[PDB]
Amino acid sequence: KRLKVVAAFQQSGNSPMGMVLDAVPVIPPELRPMVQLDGGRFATSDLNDLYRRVINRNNRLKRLIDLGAPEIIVNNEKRMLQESVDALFDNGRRGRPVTGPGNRPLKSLSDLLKGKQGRFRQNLLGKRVDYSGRSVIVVGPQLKLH
Amino acid sequence: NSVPGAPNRVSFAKLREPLEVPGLLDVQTDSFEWLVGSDRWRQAAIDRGEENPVGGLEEVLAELSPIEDFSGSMSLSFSDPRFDEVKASVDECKDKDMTYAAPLFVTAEFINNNTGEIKSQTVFMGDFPMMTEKGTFIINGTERVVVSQLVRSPGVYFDETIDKSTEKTLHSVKVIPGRGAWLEFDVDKRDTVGVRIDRKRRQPVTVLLKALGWTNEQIVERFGFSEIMMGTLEKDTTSGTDEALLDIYRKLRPGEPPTKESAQTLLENLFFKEKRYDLARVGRYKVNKKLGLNAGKPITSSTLTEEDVVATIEYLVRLHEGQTSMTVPGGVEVPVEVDDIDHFGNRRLRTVGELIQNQIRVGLSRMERVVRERMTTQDVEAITPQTLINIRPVVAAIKEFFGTSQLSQFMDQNNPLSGLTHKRRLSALGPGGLSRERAGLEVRDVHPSHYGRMCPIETPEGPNIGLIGSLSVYARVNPFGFIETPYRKVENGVVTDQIDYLTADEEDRHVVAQANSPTDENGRFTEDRVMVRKKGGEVEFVSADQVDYMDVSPRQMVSVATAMIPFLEHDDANRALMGANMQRQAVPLVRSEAPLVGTGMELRAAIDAGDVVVADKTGVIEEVSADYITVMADDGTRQSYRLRKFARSNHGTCANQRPIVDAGQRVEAGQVIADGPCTQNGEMALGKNLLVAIMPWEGHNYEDAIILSNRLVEEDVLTSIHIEEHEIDARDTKLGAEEITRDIPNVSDEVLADLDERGIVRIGAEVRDGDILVGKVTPKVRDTSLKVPHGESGKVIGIRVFSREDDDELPAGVNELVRVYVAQKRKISDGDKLAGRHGNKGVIGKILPVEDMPFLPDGTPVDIILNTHGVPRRMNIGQILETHLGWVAKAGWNIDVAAGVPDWASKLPEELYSAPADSTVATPVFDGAQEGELAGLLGSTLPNRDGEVMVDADGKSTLFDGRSGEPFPYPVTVGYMYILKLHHLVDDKIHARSTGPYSMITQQPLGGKAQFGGQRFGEMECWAMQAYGAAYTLQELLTIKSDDTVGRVKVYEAIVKGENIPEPGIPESFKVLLKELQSLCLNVEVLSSDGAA
Amino acid sequence: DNRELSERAAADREWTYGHVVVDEAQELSEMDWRLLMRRCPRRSFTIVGDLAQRRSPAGARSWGAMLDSYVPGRWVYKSLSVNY
Amino acid sequence: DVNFFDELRIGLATADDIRNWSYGEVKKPETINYRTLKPEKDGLFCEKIFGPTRDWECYCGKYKRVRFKGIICERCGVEVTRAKVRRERMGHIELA
Ligand SMILES: [Zn+2]
């Protein structure tokens, strides 16, 4: 069971260094829509909140390293950054998820393609189509087969 | 007879009915009268011998009272529920969207026990919805019905199963209350008796007995007869009551600290204290009946008791050992046997009254907490009964029931039979019942206990198959909710006139004979052997002296809709089911015509449906008008009856009522005075009598297609009226109010021509598809007018308007409302469905000119052609027989009696020896015309106008081809058949689309009849396309036509510009998927066949 | 599994038998009777033997001493004196 | 060129791949502007990173019409281009 992974890394140029991240990609804005609702309220995908949290933790870690704080506080902030990135990628995978005001977990990046209405299952399910109609049938005995 | 105005429909029946068909709406009205404790119900109950009967509301108020403070210092009690007269009449409620209701008042008594002071006060409890004389409730002007719910009765149920691990036979028992914890006992594969309390973990049963106060000596004395009980007792690590109670408490309250008081009181609160556990009156009755306890004593308590538990244990042990008889100390001997769950001895009807009573109980429970609080938060001097009560929870609960409960349903007003069947419907699915999702075949299957109680034929064919049925015509509801049916008593081989209503449990203890069994003078059976039904649901030839009961009528088992199928016994069960279902979906016709061949049931069914107007008391007609009729009774008092004219039904069908009586006519009490939508002279008329020829014809009736004569279109034989209802309301918003007005911006001067000064289209205007109905504008102003939907058209028949300036009682945020009614008259057309009463449904494939139809030598062209190849395979020759009799009904008949009665006619009553043309006949479903009688009558038909016998003795005629003109080389079966126009009309069954509105959260089209939605393309259709290998068409369906936005705009403009449809490039789904994958730090790369790219 | 009754019964110690036949039962010790009673909760037994013939040291000296711990006063004694 | 879309490969992305995909680093946790509903500069919706919300409309307005293509505005860095680019342009965050 271990040689499976070890060989999967042996038999290719694939470096294992990709399993540790130094940078985090941000999905284009229109894939995570934010809009104002009727009456001045706002609708927003949870992805924006997760990205905001990650950015907050990263900026505060930079500040702490600038301030010369002792290692304990700095690496506690590092732990928080790690947790924020984990929540961004797969919120519920580890322990208890980050939850919104409704006491329900936020949807993460993985949920985009994980769920029953995920990207990989969109095409498979039946869908409505234009230029179509439906009607009752009767026998046209005078018709030709075509 | 019992119907003064009945037309003289001669009947082929041989046996007399010793019992009249009861009131078909009694299942609703009697239950509701019980709920409100009406005087009529009380008198009927005490006549039946019930001891001081109590009404439904009285029961709940007696349960509720006395409300007491937890200090014991005060009490509150409720009594004397009574109703004031209804605020408005039924028609006023329908007009103005009010609920038909009566104020409810209760006498409330408050007592201060510390002083002993008394205060009594009349308290208004709310407007209580009231049932109409038709068995319906007017809720917000809409007429609704409450269906009776089939549910398992509370009680003790024994069961037997096989242990798959050992193939051993195991027994178990469940005590199931109306409310409370469950109590199960069982004998397992290792021969030890155990108990499950509150569905917690299993224990030795003695652990309960010790917890109840039994010592080992008592357990040995009672249960010593069985070695397994002694082995369970001797292998139990419990010493006495306290240890057993603590052990029970641990399982019952895991993780909580156990103490003597906690366990001792918890075990009592579980089963023996009323506020947390109770068998309903029916549950107590059932437990006492099965366990043989409290016999000869009145049912006056609801809790389980020590004797019930001990007797249940002993019953289980006796059953396990294979014993058949059991008697308990202080009880009576009873049979030992497992219980069939599906038997109507265990199923019961929670009718309308009990359904309303439960929600009243919930609301009163809320109000009780209100009283518990505000009784203890006010000066004892100031508190009064009216200041302790808040009625809002009760009114809210009643409104919730009548507005949201699955069992409260819009009444099926398609036609009178549909509504009548809806009122008599029995539904197993609903709150606290079962569901279509997981109900197995076991509950759906017909049961031998259903005989005479639930119709085996009339049930839906879809996922509701078996879950919804109909009450039999002779059945009534036992006050405990069990269905009971009448039987004639039989003794010493002679039948007698005593009628006993037996439940299924009672009936299983008797032998019941077949009603059709012959009996000579004074009732003795002619033959020495008789068909009888037996407890196993079995049929046997028993000795004629071995019969205890007999069925009162041959058709005791059928429902109303099933009884209306002539020659029912000649049709297969599936096709009889289809015909019964189709009768309910027949649309009213402009003119109704009673069937030539019918049953005795049409008249009573129509009368009890209530669509016909019936005189209340004998008198003479003073006035007749299209709108109202006025009668003067022999008392000298005067009555006026109002007729519904062109009123819309819940399903859009026309509910026109017509007067039949002439001025000055003698009208007796109960006589029909005005016909309903589907009645002629009082008796129901759901279709038309058409001249039918049974033959294939040029392939235009291939695969059950139907050919119609153009006469039916020309003479409006099958024409029907439909009324559509459109709403638009003027409201307000943050940006201001909304205006209904004629001054719509930028609309052409003619488009608003038919509109009035307010902007509402005038009555009598012919409105086209897409035309304006009511002009409305809203701030931004904008055009938001009400317009005729796609495909719809007709004449504006009526307008109704509501404004807050008139105290309209509309909801919040609305300033005006307008309802427009559009009437459309539809002739029969191609694609419309027709069907007989035998399940012979079909679609009209062709309508032929009158000269093209095959015609009789007399010159009469046939009205309809039905293909032969349908009858033999589908097994519904009852349509053929009817056809033959139909001719014998149109042309008269005359049996020669000069020398003597012919042998085949020897069973005909003397009244059936001759009848004139167009004479209606009755052939009841299980006692009617035999084959020989029908053949003889075919031989005895009168000739036509010119003296020619058009149809031979075999029912065939020499038809002529209307096109070539030569006769057909063989005679063809010709006759008259009763045909129904079904509600599946083409006008709204057709859909079409080419782009339009789209979904937004995901971009696929919409789906809906009135929303211009497209057709679904499932995965199976994709499989078919892949099997063809038509890749490009599949791609069009998958991307351009369904999801793509840019692709859609491009392709539409390409078609409009007449240019090549662009060949799709990189899919749009792929590009979003790629970025979604990349956002998770996955390097996804497109590879060319030659290298990375 | 579709095993014979004997196959399924002999493989499991928890199997409870409907009847137990014991011949030469005098040789059974108290623990053997305990085991057999554990395997026959229904308490249906046909016990056959002759006390004088006992060879086992732990065998029964009298039927009561063995059977009263399980069915005191609920066991029937029969004898066959004639020898042929 | 879907005519050469023959195989699809998946693998671990390295930090250099993430930096090559991205048009710019998201620096601030800002949302759409509460004051005017415009995107914040350097926010998660920054136009300088992800492109303009409205076609050929410069952030500072020095280029505003269809005839202009591809030009970076020297004063605010937004590219005068079609708005659809906001559905494809990737960002990144540099972790400390
Ligand atoms: Zn600029």
From Swiss-Prot, chain A:
Signal peptide as annotated in the record: none
Functional description taken from the UniProt entry: DNA-dependent RNA polymerase catalyzes the transcription of DNA into RNA using the four ribonucleoside triphosphates as substrates.
Assembly, per entry: The RNAP catalytic core consists of 2 alpha, 1 beta, 1 beta' and 1 omega subunit. When a sigma factor is associated with the core the holoenzyme is formed, which can initiate transcription.
Family assignment from sequence similarity: Belongs to the RNA polymerase beta' chain family.
This protein's name: DNA-directed RNA polymerase subunit beta'
Organism: Mycolicibacterium smegmatis (strain ATCC 700084 / mc(2)155)
Gene name in the database record: rpoC
UniProtKB/Swiss-Prot annotation, chain B:
One term under GO cellular component: DNA-directed RNA polymerase complex
Enzyme class: transferase
GO biological process entries: DNA-templated transcription; response to antibiotic
SUPFAM superfamilies: beta and beta-prime subunits of DNA dependent RNA-polymerase (SSF64484)
Effect of Q409 to K/L: Rifampicin (Rif) resistant
Enzyme Commission number(s) of this protein: 2.7.7.6
Reaction catalyzed: RNA(n) + a ribonucleoside 5'-triphosphate = RNA(n+1) + diphosphate
CDD domains per record: RNA_pol_B_RPB2 (cd00653)
Keyword Nucleotidyltransferase belongs to the record: yes
Function: DNA-dependent RNA polymerase catalyzes the transcription of DNA into RNA using the four ribonucleoside triphosphates as substrates. This subunit often mutates to generate rifampicin (Rif) resistance. Interaction with RbpA partially restores Rif-inhibited transcription; once the subunit is Rif-resistant however RbpA no longer stimulates transcription.
Name the UniProt record assigns to this protein: DNA-directed RNA polymerase subunit beta
Curated annotation (Swiss-Prot), chain D:
Binding residues for Zn(2+) 1: C58, C60, C73, C76
Disulphide-bridged cysteine pairs: none
Function description: DNA-dependent RNA polymerase catalyzes the transcription of DNA into RNA using the four ribonucleoside triphosphates as substrates.
The protein's assembly and partners: The RNAP catalytic core consists of 2 alpha, 1 beta, 1 beta' and 1 omega subunit. When a sigma factor is associated with the core the holoenzyme is formed, which can initiate transcription.
Family from the record: Belongs to the RNA polymerase beta' chain family.
Protein name (Swiss-Prot/TrEMBL): DNA-directed RNA polymerase subunit beta'
Organism name: Mycolicibacterium smegmatis (strain ATCC 700084 / mc(2)155) (Mycobacterium smegmatis)
Range of the intact protein held here: 3 to 98 of 1317
